[PDB]
Write a protein that binds this ligand. Structure first.
Ligand SMILES: CN1C(=O)CCc2cc3cc(c21)OCCOC[C@H]1CNCCN1c1ncc(Cl)c(n1)N3
Ligand SMILES: CN1C(=O)CCc2cc3cc(c21)OCCOC[C@H]1CNCCN1c1ncc(Cl)c(n1)N3
Ligand SMILES: [Cl-]
Ligand SMILES: [Cl-]
Lengths: 123, 123
């Protein structure tokens, strides 16, 4: 393990990917959540969600430009998790815990799911 | 700053992007370095290199699938930096410092450049 470790590099990369998303640069998919639409990078969604990973790894589904989620999926809960994917920061509150946990479970985000379980234990 | 911070999330994302690159999943550019070719994600290259950021932010150059570097650019030095971009780990040695520093300077990777300067000061 002779290589030099840059402790800030991963966070710097994520910050710049979020800036790319903010500027709509090289976004290649739209996630439709009821009346709300969210543009993103498939590479990012696959890197953070078991649901999106299982969809785009399949060469048949790889080129999809639009994804539609379950109508019982809360748009604000998806937005909080889309923000998490791009920032490492989760907006967890007692007023949104159940919607956020239901959305993370659906999206197969094991660590968010684990944190939601810890939040409840601490609530 | 009420949001929960996931200290491992950024590194997890980068690890999965490197796995995507390893599996040639959603790669969209080839960087030609003399007789060597390297496939990657433009979003990743832009997030790590001033050179690649300046190229793909320009809507005229955004859709380029092939980039050719200066013939004096060392393929092993580019490979070490491409690995760095995707891992946060830099393979710096006295036997490759000058080639790696010349390549980072060319690619406009200020932090790699800074570390190379610190390595020399410590060498
Ligand atoms: C379930 N799941 C979560 O709960 C958290 C987030 C997450 C991210 C991904 C996939 C996930 C999940 O579910 C599929 C199972 O994991 C496969 C993993 C492990 N074996 C090596 C390859 N893997 C991989 N390689 C590339 C990507 Cl981009 C990736 N996983 N993405
Ligand atoms: C020179 N340079 C380096 O030396 C290190 C790596 C690096 C990464 C990028 C661009 C770089 C560099 O050079 C252009 C100047 O920086 C622009 C920055 C700062 N103002 C906010 C927006 N910025 C930004 N936003 C998105 C991306 Cl994807 C990005 N930068 N990439
Ligand atoms: Cl997660
Ligand atoms: Cl850098």
């Amino acid at each position: 393990d002779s290589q030099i470790q840059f402790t800030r590099h991963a966070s710097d990369v994520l910050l710049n990917l979020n800036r790319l998303r903010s500027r709509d640069i090289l976004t290649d998919v739209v996630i439709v959540v009821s009346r709300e639409q969210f543009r993103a990078h498939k590479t990012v969604l696959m890197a953070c969600s078991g649901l999106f990973y299982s969809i785009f790894t399949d060469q048949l589904k790889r080129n999809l430009s639009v994804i539609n989620l379950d109508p019982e999926i809360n748009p604000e809960g998806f937005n909080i998790l889309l923000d998490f994917m791009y920032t490492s920061r989760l907006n967890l509150r007692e007023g949104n815990i159940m919607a956020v946990m239901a959305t993370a479970m659906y999206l197969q985000m094991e660590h968010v799911v684990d944190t939601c379980r810890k939040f409840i234990k601490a609530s």
